[PDB]
Amino acid sequence: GSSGSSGSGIIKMAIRFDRRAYPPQITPKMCLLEWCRREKLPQPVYETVQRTIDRMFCSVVTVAEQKYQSTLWDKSKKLAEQTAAIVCLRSQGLPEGRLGEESPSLNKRKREAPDQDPGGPRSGPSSG
């Protein structure tokens, strides 16, 4: 059973891509896909946007109709992409994180956005 995600919709978690965590011959993004093959799951979708407050880059992966965004941006867009994967794996509970899942860090920032009502894509041609 689930542990208890904090947030209705997108599972947000504190994670920061750590190069030292993985060798130059292995990437956290490849580990995810390799996992989607066994679970007959459809390839994920990476999406990196640029904010205006900190002009920082942040990627967001989506698997099994579940989005995984990190609460920690990245200096570059390329790096942000790495985080995504990790976040996904951790959420699924794969061993593709133990490497550096935990780490001594005093970072805590919960971003909040105003919303009167939910939305999303256009599930079906008719209301749903």
Side-chain angles (χ1 to χ4, degrees), residues 30-125:
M30 294 173 59
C31 275
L32 175 59
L33 269 39
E34 288 288 305
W35 173 87
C36 87
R37 275 171 77 275
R38 84 173 299 86
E39 281 289 293
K40 290 209 87 189
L41 286 173
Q43 208 170 271
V45 178
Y46 281 41
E47 272 169 39
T48 329
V49 304
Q50 187 190 13
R51 60 199 315 200
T52 316
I53 181 86
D54 205 53
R55 306 273 286 194
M56 210 61 136
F57 294 111
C58 69
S59 200
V60 181
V61 67
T62 299
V63 182
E65 301 207 299
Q66 180 59 50
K67 283 155 272 199
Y68 310 86
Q69 172 197 86
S70 173
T71 61
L72 304 172
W73 296 68
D74 303 57
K75 56 196 285 275
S76 82
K77 168 269 172 75
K78 270 271 158 63
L79 294 166
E81 303 205 278
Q82 307 270 255
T83 303
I86 296 162
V87 194
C88 192
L89 312 181
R90 270 202 80 204
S91 273
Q92 303 167 359
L94 311 171
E96 279 53 59
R98 67 166 277 163
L99 285 157
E101 48 184 332
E102 279 151 88
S103 193
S105 283
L106 271 74
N107 271 231
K108 31 195 291 305
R109 298 272 165 174
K110 62 199 210 288
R111 185 88 203 82
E112 278 284 69
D115 210 45
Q116 72 282 328
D117 281 315
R122 40 270 208 287
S123 304

Coordinates of all heavy atoms in Angstrom, one line a residue, residues 30-125:
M30 N 17.6 6.4 -18.2 CA 17.6 5.1 -18.9 C 17.0 4.0 -18.0 O 16.3 3.1 -18.5 CB 19.0 4.7 -19.4 CG 19.6 5.6 -20.4 SD 21.3 5.3 -20.8 CE 21.2 3.5 -21.3
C31 N 17.3 4.1 -16.7 CA 16.8 3.1 -15.7 C 15.3 3.0 -15.7 O 14.7 2.0 -15.6 CB 17.4 3.4 -14.3 SG 19.0 2.8 -14.0
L32 N 14.7 4.2 -15.8 CA 13.2 4.3 -15.8 C 12.6 3.5 -17.0 O 11.8 2.6 -16.9 CB 12.8 5.8 -15.9 CG 11.3 6.0 -16.0 CD1 10.5 5.4 -14.9 CD2 11.0 7.5 -16.1
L33 N 13.0 3.9 -18.2 CA 12.6 3.3 -19.5 C 12.7 1.8 -19.4 O 11.8 1.0 -19.7 CB 13.3 3.8 -20.7 CG 12.7 5.1 -21.4 CD1 12.1 6.0 -20.3 CD2 13.7 5.8 -22.2
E34 N 13.9 1.4 -19.0 CA 14.2 -0.1 -18.9 C 13.2 -0.8 -17.9 O 13.0 -2.0 -18.0 CB 15.6 -0.3 -18.4 CG 16.7 0.0 -19.4 CD 16.8 -1.0 -20.5 OE1 16.9 -2.2 -20.2 OE2 16.7 -0.6 -21.7
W35 N 12.6 0.0 -17.0 CA 11.7 -0.5 -16.1 C 10.2 -0.5 -16.7 O 9.4 -1.3 -16.3 CB 11.7 0.3 -14.8 CG 10.6 0.0 -13.8 CD1 10.6 -1.0 -12.9 CD2 9.3 0.6 -13.7 NE1 9.4 -1.1 -12.2 CE2 8.6 -0.1 -12.7 CE3 8.7 1.6 -14.4 CZ2 7.3 0.2 -12.3 CZ3 7.4 1.9 -14.0 CH2 6.7 1.3 -13.0
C36 N 10.0 0.4 -17.6 CA 8.7 0.5 -18.2 C 8.5 -0.6 -19.2 O 7.4 -0.8 -19.7 CB 8.6 1.9 -18.9 SG 9.2 1.9 -20.6
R37 N 9.6 -1.2 -19.6 CA 9.5 -2.3 -20.5 C 8.9 -3.6 -19.9 O 8.2 -4.3 -20.5 CB 10.9 -2.6 -21.1 CG 11.3 -1.8 -22.3 CD 12.7 -1.9 -22.7 NE 13.0 -3.2 -23.4 CZ 13.2 -4.4 -22.8 NH1 13.2 -4.5 -21.5 NH2 13.4 -5.4 -23.6
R38 N 9.3 -3.9 -18.6 CA 8.8 -5.0 -17.9 C 7.4 -4.8 -17.5 O 6.6 -5.7 -17.5 CB 9.7 -5.3 -16.7 CG 9.4 -4.5 -15.5 CD 10.2 -4.9 -14.3 NE 10.0 -6.3 -13.9 CZ 10.6 -7.3 -14.4 NH1 11.6 -7.1 -15.4 NH2 10.4 -8.5 -14.1
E39 N 7.1 -3.6 -17.0 CA 5.7 -3.3 -16.5 C 4.8 -3.0 -17.7 O 3.7 -2.4 -17.5 CB 5.8 -2.1 -15.6 CG 6.2 -2.5 -14.2 CD 5.2 -3.3 -13.4 OE1 4.1 -2.8 -13.1 OE2 5.4 -4.5 -13.2
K40 N 5.3 -3.3 -18.9 CA 4.5 -3.1 -20.1 C 3.9 -1.7 -20.1 O 2.9 -1.4 -20.7 CB 3.4 -4.1 -20.2 CG 3.8 -5.5 -20.6 CD 2.8 -6.3 -21.3 CE 2.9 -6.1 -22.8 NZ 1.8 -6.7 -23.6
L41 N 4.6 -0.8 -19.4 CA 4.1 0.6 -19.3 C 4.7 1.4 -20.5 O 5.8 1.2 -21.0 CB 4.6 1.2 -18.0 CG 3.9 0.8 -16.7 CD1 4.5 1.3 -15.5 CD2 2.4 1.2 -16.8
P42 N 3.8 2.4 -21.0 CA 4.2 3.2 -22.1 C 5.3 4.3 -21.7 O 5.3 4.8 -20.6 CB 2.9 4.0 -22.4 CG 2.1 4.0 -21.1 CD 2.5 2.7 -20.4
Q43 N 6.2 4.4 -22.6 CA 7.3 5.4 -22.4 C 6.8 6.6 -21.8 O 5.8 7.2 -22.1 CB 8.0 5.7 -23.7 CG 9.5 6.0 -23.6 CD 10.2 6.1 -24.9 OE1 10.8 5.1 -25.4 NE2 10.3 7.3 -25.5
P44 N 7.6 7.2 -20.8 CA 7.3 8.4 -20.1 C 7.4 9.6 -21.0 O 7.7 9.5 -22.2 CB 8.3 8.5 -19.0 CG 9.5 7.7 -19.5 CD 8.9 6.6 -20.3
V45 N 7.1 10.8 -20.4 CA 7.2 12.1 -21.1 C 7.8 13.2 -20.3 O 7.2 13.6 -19.4 CB 5.8 12.5 -21.6 CG1 5.8 13.9 -22.3 CG2 5.1 11.5 -22.4
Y46 N 9.0 13.5 -20.7 CA 9.8 14.6 -20.0 C 9.3 16.0 -20.5 O 9.2 16.2 -21.7 CB 11.3 14.4 -20.2 CG 11.9 13.3 -19.3 CD1 11.2 12.1 -19.1 CD2 13.1 13.5 -18.7 CE1 11.8 11.1 -18.3 CE2 13.7 12.5 -17.9 CZ 13.0 11.3 -17.8 OH 13.5 10.3 -17.0
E47 N 9.2 16.9 -19.5 CA 8.8 18.2 -19.8 C 9.5 19.2 -18.9 O 9.3 19.3 -17.7 CB 7.3 18.4 -19.7 CG 6.5 18.1 -20.9 CD 5.0 17.9 -20.7 OE1 4.5 18.8 -19.9 OE2 4.3 17.1 -21.3
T48 N 10.4 20.0 -19.5 CA 11.1 21.0 -18.8 C 10.7 22.4 -19.2 O 10.7 22.8 -20.3 CB 12.7 20.9 -19.1 OG1 13.0 19.5 -19.4 CG2 13.5 21.4 -17.9
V49 N 10.3 23.2 -18.1 CA 9.8 24.6 -18.3 C 10.8 25.6 -17.7 O 11.7 25.2 -16.9 CB 8.4 24.8 -17.8 CG1 7.5 23.8 -18.4 CG2 8.4 24.7 -16.3
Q50 N 10.6 26.8 -18.0 CA 11.5 27.9 -17.5 C 10.6 28.9 -16.7 O 9.7 29.6 -17.3 CB 12.2 28.6 -18.6 CG 13.3 29.6 -18.1 CD 13.9 30.4 -19.2 OE1 13.4 30.5 -20.3 NE2 15.0 31.1 -18.9
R51 N 10.9 29.1 -15.4 CA 10.2 30.0 -14.6 C 10.7 31.4 -14.8 O 11.6 31.7 -15.5 CB 10.3 29.6 -13.1 CG 11.8 29.6 -12.6 CD 11.9 28.8 -11.3 NE 10.8 29.1 -10.4 CZ 10.9 28.8 -9.1 NH1 12.0 28.3 -8.6 NH2 9.9 29.1 -8.3
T52 N 10.1 32.4 -14.1 CA 10.5 33.8 -14.2 C 11.0 34.3 -12.9 O 11.8 35.3 -12.9 CB 9.3 34.7 -14.6 OG1 8.5 34.0 -15.7 CG2 9.7 36.0 -15.1
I53 N 10.7 33.7 -11.8 CA 11.1 34.1 -10.5 C 12.6 33.8 -10.3 O 13.4 34.6 -9.9 CB 10.4 33.3 -9.4 CG1 10.9 33.8 -8.0 CG2 10.5 31.8 -9.5 CD1 10.2 35.0 -7.5
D54 N 13.0 32.5 -10.6 CA 14.4 32.1 -10.5 C 15.0 31.7 -11.9 O 16.0 31.1 -12.0 CB 14.6 31.0 -9.5 CG 16.0 31.0 -8.9 OD1 16.4 32.0 -8.4 OD2 16.6 29.9 -8.9
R55 N 14.2 32.0 -12.9 CA 14.6 31.6 -14.3 C 15.3 30.2 -14.3 O 16.2 30.0 -15.1 CB 15.5 32.6 -14.9 CG 15.0 34.0 -14.9 CD 14.1 34.3 -16.1 NE 14.9 34.5 -17.3 CZ 14.4 35.0 -18.4 NH1 13.2 35.4 -18.5 NH2 15.2 35.2 -19.5
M56 N 14.9 29.4 -13.3 CA 15.5 28.0 -13.2 C 14.7 27.0 -14.1 O 13.6 27.3 -14.5 CB 15.5 27.6 -11.8 CG 16.6 26.6 -11.4 SD 18.2 27.4 -11.6 CE 19.0 26.8 -10.1
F57 N 15.3 25.9 -14.3 CA 14.7 24.8 -15.2 C 14.3 23.7 -14.3 O 14.9 23.3 -13.3 CB 15.7 24.3 -16.2 CG 16.1 25.4 -17.2 CD1 17.3 25.9 -17.3 CD2 15.1 25.8 -18.2 CE1 17.7 26.9 -18.2 CE2 15.5 26.8 -19.1 CZ 16.7 27.3 -19.1
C58 N 13.1 23.1 -14.7 CA 12.6 22.0 -13.9 C 11.8 21.0 -14.9 O 10.9 21.4 -15.6 CB 11.6 22.5 -12.8 SG 10.1 23.2 -13.5
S59 N 12.2 19.8 -14.8 CA 11.6 18.7 -15.7 C 10.5 18.0 -14.9 O 10.5 17.9 -13.7 CB 12.6 17.8 -16.2 OG 12.1 17.1 -17.3
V60 N 9.5 17.4 -15.7 CA 8.4 16.7 -15.1 C 8.1 15.5 -15.9 O 7.6 15.6 -17.0 CB 7.2 17.6 -14.9 CG1 6.0 16.8 -14.2 CG2 7.5 18.8 -14.1
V61 N 8.3 14.3 -15.3 CA 8.0 13.0 -16.0 C 6.6 12.6 -15.7 O 6.0 12.9 -14.6 CB 9.0 11.9 -15.6 CG1 8.8 11.5 -14.2 CG2 8.8 10.7 -16.5
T62 N 6.0 11.8 -16.6 CA 4.6 11.3 -16.4 C 4.5 9.8 -16.8 O 4.8 9.5 -18.0 CB 3.6 12.1 -17.2 OG1 3.6 13.5 -16.8 CG2 2.2 11.5 -17.1
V63 N 4.2 9.0 -15.9 CA 4.1 7.5 -16.1 C 2.8 7.0 -15.5 O 2.4 7.4 -14.4 CB 5.3 6.8 -15.6 CG1 5.2 5.3 -15.9 CG2 6.6 7.3 -16.2
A64 N 2.2 6.0 -16.1 CA 0.9 5.4 -15.6 C -0.1 6.4 -15.2 O -0.7 6.3 -14.2 CB 1.3 4.5 -14.5
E65 N -0.2 7.5 -16.0 CA -1.1 8.6 -15.7 C -0.8 9.2 -14.4 O -1.7 9.7 -13.6 CB -2.6 8.0 -15.6 CG -3.0 7.4 -16.9 CD -4.5 7.4 -17.1 OE1 -5.3 6.9 -16.3 OE2 -5.0 8.0 -18.1
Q66 N 0.5 9.3 -14.0 CA 1.0 9.9 -12.8 C 2.2 10.8 -13.1 O 3.2 10.3 -13.6 CB 1.3 8.8 -11.8 CG 1.8 9.3 -10.5 CD 0.8 10.2 -9.8 OE1 -0.3 9.9 -9.6 NE2 1.3 11.4 -9.4
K67 N 2.0 12.0 -12.7 CA 3.1 13.0 -12.9 C 4.0 13.1 -11.7 O 3.6 12.9 -10.5 CB 2.5 14.4 -13.1 CG 2.0 14.6 -14.5 CD 0.9 15.7 -14.6 CE -0.5 15.1 -14.3 NZ -1.6 16.0 -14.8
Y68 N 5.3 13.2 -11.9 CA 6.3 13.3 -10.9 C 7.2 14.5 -11.0 O 8.1 14.5 -11.9 CB 7.1 12.0 -10.8 CG 6.3 10.7 -10.9 CD1 5.9 10.2 -12.1 CD2 6.0 10.1 -9.7 CE1 5.1 9.0 -12.1 CE2 5.2 8.9 -9.7 CZ 4.8 8.4 -10.9 OH 4.1 7.2 -11.0
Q69 N 7.0 15.5 -10.2 CA 7.8 16.7 -10.2 C 8.5 16.9 -8.9 O 8.0 16.7 -7.8 CB 6.9 17.9 -10.5 CG 7.6 19.3 -10.4 CD 6.6 20.4 -10.2 OE1 6.2 20.8 -9.1 NE2 6.3 21.1 -11.3
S70 N 9.8 17.4 -9.0 CA 10.6 17.6 -7.9 C 10.5 19.0 -7.4 O 10.2 20.0 -8.1 CB 12.1 17.4 -8.2 OG 12.9 17.7 -7.1
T71 N 10.6 19.2 -6.0 CA 10.5 20.5 -5.4 C 11.8 21.3 -5.5 O 12.0 22.3 -4.8 CB 10.0 20.4 -4.0 OG1 11.0 19.7 -3.2 CG2 8.7 19.7 -3.9
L72 N 12.8 20.8 -6.2 CA 14.1 21.4 -6.4 C 14.5 21.6 -7.8 O 14.7 20.6 -8.5 CB 15.2 20.6 -5.6 CG 14.9 20.3 -4.1 CD1 15.9 19.3 -3.6 CD2 14.9 21.6 -3.3
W73 N 14.6 22.8 -8.3 CA 14.9 23.1 -9.6 C 16.4 22.8 -9.9 O 17.1 22.3 -9.0 CB 14.7 24.6 -9.9 CG 13.2 25.0 -9.9 CD1 12.5 25.0 -8.7 CD2 12.4 25.4 -11.0 NE1 11.2 25.4 -9.1 CE2 11.1 25.7 -10.4 CE3 12.6 25.6 -12.3 CZ2 10.1 26.1 -11.2 CZ3 11.5 26.0 -13.1 CH2 10.3 26.2 -12.6
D74 N 16.8 23.0 -11.1 CA 18.2 22.7 -11.5 C 18.8 23.9 -12.3 O 18.2 24.6 -13.0 CB 18.3 21.5 -12.4 CG 17.7 20.2 -11.7 OD1 16.5 20.3 -11.3 OD2 18.4 19.2 -11.6
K75 N 20.1 24.1 -12.1 CA 20.8 25.2 -12.7 C 20.6 25.2 -14.2 O 20.4 26.2 -14.8 CB 22.3 25.1 -12.4 CG 23.0 23.8 -12.8 CD 24.3 23.6 -12.1 CE 25.4 24.4 -12.8 NZ 26.0 23.8 -14.0
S76 N 20.7 24.0 -14.8 CA 20.5 23.8 -16.2 C 19.3 22.9 -16.5 O 18.9 22.1 -15.7 CB 21.8 23.2 -16.9 OG 21.8 21.8 -16.7
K77 N 18.8 23.0 -17.7 CA 17.6 22.2 -18.1 C 18.0 20.7 -18.3 O 17.3 19.8 -17.9 CB 17.1 22.7 -19.5 CG 16.1 21.7 -20.1 CD 16.8 20.8 -21.1 CE 15.8 19.7 -21.5 NZ 14.9 20.2 -22.6
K78 N 19.2 20.5 -18.8 CA 19.7 19.1 -19.0 C 19.7 18.3 -17.7 O 19.2 17.2 -17.6 CB 21.1 19.1 -19.6 CG 21.1 19.1 -21.1 CD 21.1 17.7 -21.6 CE 20.6 17.6 -23.1 NZ 21.5 18.4 -24.0
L79 N 20.2 19.0 -16.6 CA 20.2 18.4 -15.3 C 18.8 18.1 -14.8 O 18.5 17.0 -14.3 CB 21.0 19.3 -14.3 CG 22.5 19.5 -14.6 CD1 23.0 20.7 -13.8 CD2 23.3 18.3 -14.3
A80 N 17.9 19.1 -14.9 CA 16.6 19.0 -14.4 C 15.9 17.7 -14.9 O 15.2 17.0 -14.2 CB 15.7 20.2 -14.8
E81 N 16.3 17.3 -16.2 CA 15.8 16.1 -16.8 C 16.1 14.9 -16.0 O 15.3 14.0 -15.8 CB 16.3 16.0 -18.2 CG 16.0 17.2 -19.1 CD 16.0 16.8 -20.6 OE1 17.0 16.8 -21.2 OE2 14.8 16.6 -21.1
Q82 N 17.3 14.9 -15.5 CA 17.8 13.7 -14.7 C 16.9 13.5 -13.5 O 16.5 12.4 -13.2 CB 19.3 14.0 -14.2 CG 20.2 14.3 -15.4 CD 20.8 13.1 -16.0 OE1 22.0 12.8 -15.8 NE2 20.1 12.3 -16.8
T83 N 16.7 14.6 -12.7 CA 15.9 14.5 -11.5 C 14.6 13.8 -11.8 O 14.2 12.8 -11.1 CB 15.5 15.9 -11.0 OG1 16.7 16.7 -10.7 CG2 14.7 15.8 -9.7
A84 N 13.8 14.2 -12.8 CA 12.6 13.6 -13.2 C 12.6 12.1 -12.9 O 12.0 11.6 -12.0 CB 12.2 13.9 -14.6
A85 N 13.4 11.4 -13.8 CA 13.5 9.9 -13.7 C 13.6 9.5 -12.2 O 12.6 8.9 -11.7 CB 14.7 9.4 -14.4
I86 N 14.7 9.8 -11.5 CA 14.9 9.5 -10.1 C 13.5 9.6 -9.4 O 13.1 8.6 -8.7 CB 15.9 10.4 -9.5 CG1 17.3 10.2 -10.1 CG2 16.0 10.1 -8.0 CD1 18.2 11.3 -9.8
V87 N 12.9 10.8 -9.4 CA 11.6 11.0 -8.8 C 10.6 9.9 -9.1 O 10.0 9.4 -8.2 CB 11.0 12.3 -9.2 CG1 9.9 12.7 -8.2 CG2 12.1 13.4 -9.2
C88 N 10.5 9.5 -10.4 CA 9.6 8.5 -10.8 C 10.0 7.1 -10.1 O 9.1 6.5 -9.5 CB 9.7 8.3 -12.3 SG 8.3 7.3 -13.0
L89 N 11.2 6.7 -10.3 CA 11.7 5.5 -9.7 C 11.3 5.4 -8.2 O 10.7 4.5 -7.8 CB 13.2 5.3 -9.9 CG 13.7 5.6 -11.3 CD1 15.2 5.3 -11.4 CD2 13.0 4.7 -12.3
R90 N 11.8 6.4 -7.5 CA 11.5 6.5 -6.0 C 10.1 6.3 -5.7 O 9.7 5.5 -4.8 CB 12.0 7.8 -5.5 CG 13.5 7.8 -5.0 CD 13.8 8.9 -4.0 NE 13.3 8.5 -2.6 CZ 13.0 9.4 -1.7 NH1 13.1 10.7 -1.9 NH2 12.6 8.9 -0.5
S91 N 9.2 6.9 -6.5 CA 7.8 6.9 -6.3 C 7.3 5.4 -6.5 O 6.4 4.9 -5.7 CB 7.0 7.8 -7.3 OG 6.9 9.1 -6.8
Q92 N 7.8 4.7 -7.5 CA 7.5 3.3 -7.8 C 8.0 2.4 -6.7 O 7.5 1.3 -6.5 CB 7.9 2.9 -9.2 CG 7.4 3.8 -10.3 CD 8.1 3.6 -11.6 OE1 9.0 2.8 -11.7 NE2 7.7 4.4 -12.6
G93 N 9.2 2.8 -6.1 CA 9.8 2.0 -5.1 C 10.9 1.1 -5.7 O 11.1 0.0 -5.2
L94 N 11.5 1.6 -6.7 CA 12.6 0.8 -7.4 C 13.9 1.0 -6.7 O 14.2 2.1 -6.1 CB 12.7 1.1 -8.9 CG 11.3 1.1 -9.6 CD1 11.5 1.7 -11.0 CD2 10.7 -0.3 -9.7
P95 N 14.8 0.0 -6.8 CA 16.1 0.0 -6.2 C 17.1 1.0 -6.9 O 18.2 1.1 -6.6 CB 16.6 -1.4 -6.3 CG 15.9 -2.0 -7.4 CD 14.5 -1.3 -7.4
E96 N 16.5 1.7 -7.9 CA 17.3 2.6 -8.7 C 17.4 3.9 -8.0 O 17.2 5.0 -8.7 CB 16.7 2.8 -10.1 CG 17.0 1.7 -11.1 CD 16.8 0.3 -10.5 OE1 15.6 0.0 -10.2 OE2 17.7 -0.5 -10.4
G97 N 17.7 3.9 -6.7 CA 17.8 5.2 -6.0 C 18.6 5.0 -4.7 O 19.3 5.9 -4.3
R98 N 18.5 3.8 -4.1 CA 19.3 3.5 -2.9 C 20.6 4.2 -2.9 O 21.2 4.6 -1.9 CB 19.4 2.0 -2.7 CG 20.3 1.3 -3.7 CD 20.6 -0.1 -3.3 NE 21.8 -0.1 -2.4 CZ 22.1 -1.1 -1.6 NH1 21.4 -2.2 -1.6 NH2 23.2 -1.0 -0.8
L99 N 21.2 4.2 -4.1 CA 22.6 4.8 -4.3 C 22.7 6.0 -3.5 O 23.6 6.1 -2.6 CB 22.8 5.1 -5.8 CG 23.1 3.9 -6.7 CD1 22.7 4.3 -8.1 CD2 24.5 3.5 -6.6
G100 N 21.9 7.0 -3.7 CA 22.0 8.2 -2.9 C 20.6 8.8 -2.6 O 20.4 10.0 -2.6
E101 N 19.6 7.9 -2.3 CA 18.3 8.3 -2.0 C 18.3 9.3 -0.9 O 17.6 10.4 -0.9 CB 17.4 7.1 -1.6 CG 18.1 6.2 -0.6 CD 17.3 4.9 -0.3 OE1 16.0 5.0 -0.5 OE2 17.9 3.9 0.0
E102 N 19.0 9.0 0.2 CA 19.1 9.9 1.4 C 20.3 10.7 1.3 O 21.4 10.3 0.8 CB 19.0 9.0 2.7 CG 17.6 8.6 3.1 CD 17.6 7.3 3.8 OE1 17.8 7.4 5.1 OE2 17.5 6.3 3.2
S103 N 20.3 11.9 1.9 CA 21.4 12.8 1.9 C 21.2 14.0 2.9 O 20.1 14.5 3.0 CB 21.7 13.3 0.5 OG 23.0 13.9 0.5
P104 N 22.2 14.4 3.6 CA 22.1 15.5 4.5 C 21.9 16.9 3.8 O 22.9 17.4 3.2 CB 23.5 15.5 5.3 CG 24.4 14.8 4.3 CD 23.6 13.8 3.5
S105 N 20.7 17.4 3.9 CA 20.4 18.7 3.2 C 19.4 19.4 4.0 O 18.4 18.9 4.5 CB 19.9 18.4 1.8 OG 21.0 18.2 0.9
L106 N 19.6 20.7 4.2 CA 18.6 21.6 4.9 C 17.8 22.4 3.9 O 17.7 23.7 4.1 CB 19.4 22.5 5.9 CG 19.7 21.9 7.3 CD1 20.8 20.9 7.2 CD2 20.0 23.0 8.2
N107 N 17.2 21.8 2.9 CA 16.4 22.5 1.9 C 15.0 22.1 2.1 O 14.6 20.9 2.1 CB 16.9 22.2 0.5 CG 18.0 23.2 0.0 OD1 17.9 23.7 -1.0 ND2 19.0 23.3 0.9
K108 N 14.1 23.1 2.2 CA 12.7 22.9 2.3 C 11.9 24.0 1.8 O 11.8 25.1 2.4 CB 12.3 22.6 3.8 CG 13.2 23.4 4.8 CD 13.1 22.8 6.2 CE 11.7 23.1 6.8 NZ 11.4 24.6 6.7
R109 N 11.3 23.9 0.6 CA 10.5 24.9 0.0 C 9.2 24.3 -0.7 O 9.3 23.6 -1.7 CB 11.3 25.7 -1.0 CG 12.5 26.4 -0.4 CD 12.1 27.8 0.1 NE 13.1 28.3 1.0 CZ 13.1 29.6 1.5 NH1 12.1 30.4 1.2 NH2 14.0 30.0 2.3
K110 N 8.0 24.6 -0.1 CA 6.8 24.1 -0.7 C 6.1 25.2 -1.5 O 5.5 26.1 -0.9 CB 5.9 23.6 0.4 CG 5.5 24.6 1.4 CD 5.0 24.0 2.7 CE 3.9 24.9 3.4 NZ 4.5 26.2 4.0
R111 N 6.2 25.1 -2.8 CA 5.5 26.1 -3.7 C 4.0 25.9 -3.7 O 3.6 24.7 -3.8 CB 6.1 26.0 -5.1 CG 5.6 27.1 -6.0 CD 6.4 28.4 -5.9 NE 5.6 29.5 -6.4 CZ 4.8 30.2 -5.6 NH1 4.6 29.8 -4.4 NH2 4.1 31.2 -6.1
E112 N 3.2 26.9 -3.7 CA 1.8 26.9 -3.7 C 1.2 27.7 -4.9 O 1.7 28.8 -5.1 CB 1.2 27.3 -2.4 CG 1.2 26.2 -1.4 CD 0.1 25.2 -1.6 OE1 0.2 24.4 -2.6 OE2 -0.8 25.1 -0.8
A113 N 0.2 27.2 -5.6 CA -0.4 27.9 -6.7 C -1.9 28.0 -6.5 O -2.6 27.1 -6.1 CB -0.1 27.2 -8.0
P114 N -2.4 29.2 -6.8 CA -3.9 29.5 -6.7 C -4.7 28.7 -7.7 O -4.4 28.7 -8.9 CB -4.0 31.0 -6.9 CG -2.8 31.3 -7.7 CD -1.7 30.4 -7.3
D115 N -5.8 28.1 -7.2 CA -6.7 27.3 -8.1 C -8.1 27.2 -7.5 O -8.2 26.6 -6.4 CB -6.1 25.9 -8.4 CG -6.5 25.4 -9.7 OD1 -6.4 26.1 -10.7 OD2 -6.9 24.2 -9.8
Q116 N -9.1 27.7 -8.2 CA -10.4 27.6 -7.7 C -11.1 26.3 -8.0 O -12.0 25.8 -7.3 CB -11.3 28.8 -8.4 CG -11.6 28.5 -9.9 CD -10.4 28.8 -10.8 OE1 -9.6 29.7 -10.4 NE2 -10.2 28.1 -11.9
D117 N -10.6 25.7 -9.1 CA -11.1 24.3 -9.5 C -10.1 23.6 -10.4 O -9.3 24.2 -11.1 CB -12.4 24.5 -10.3 CG -13.6 24.7 -9.3 OD1 -13.7 24.0 -8.3 OD2 -14.4 25.6 -9.6
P118 N -10.2 22.3 -10.4 CA -9.3 21.4 -11.2 C -9.5 21.5 -12.7 O -10.4 22.2 -13.1 CB -9.5 20.0 -10.6 CG -10.9 20.1 -10.1 CD -11.1 21.5 -9.6
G119 N -8.8 20.8 -13.4 CA -9.0 20.8 -14.9 C -8.3 19.6 -15.6 O -8.7 18.5 -15.4
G120 N -7.2 19.9 -16.3 CA -6.5 18.8 -17.0 C -6.8 18.8 -18.5 O -7.3 19.8 -19.1
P121 N -6.5 17.7 -19.2 CA -6.7 17.5 -20.6 C -8.2 17.5 -21.0 O -9.0 17.8 -20.2 CB -6.0 16.2 -20.9 CG -6.0 15.5 -19.6 CD -5.9 16.5 -18.5
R122 N -8.5 17.0 -22.2 CA -9.8 16.9 -22.6 C -10.3 15.4 -22.7 O -10.5 14.8 -23.7 CB -10.0 17.5 -24.0 CG -8.8 17.2 -24.9 CD -7.7 18.3 -24.8 NE -7.0 18.4 -26.0 CZ -6.1 17.5 -26.5 NH1 -5.9 16.4 -25.8 NH2 -5.4 17.7 -27.6
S123 N -10.4 14.8 -21.5 CA -10.8 13.4 -21.4 C -12.2 13.2 -22.0 O -13.2 13.4 -21.4 CB -10.8 12.9 -19.9 OG -9.6 13.2 -19.3
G124 N -12.2 12.7 -23.3 CA -13.4 12.5 -24.0 C -14.0 13.7 -24.6 O -13.8 14.9 -24.1
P125 N -14.7 13.6 -25.7 CA -15.3 14.7 -26.5 C -16.4 15.3 -25.7 O -16.9 16.4 -26.0 CB -15.8 14.0 -27.8 CG -16.0 12.6 -27.4 CD -15.0 12.3 -26.4

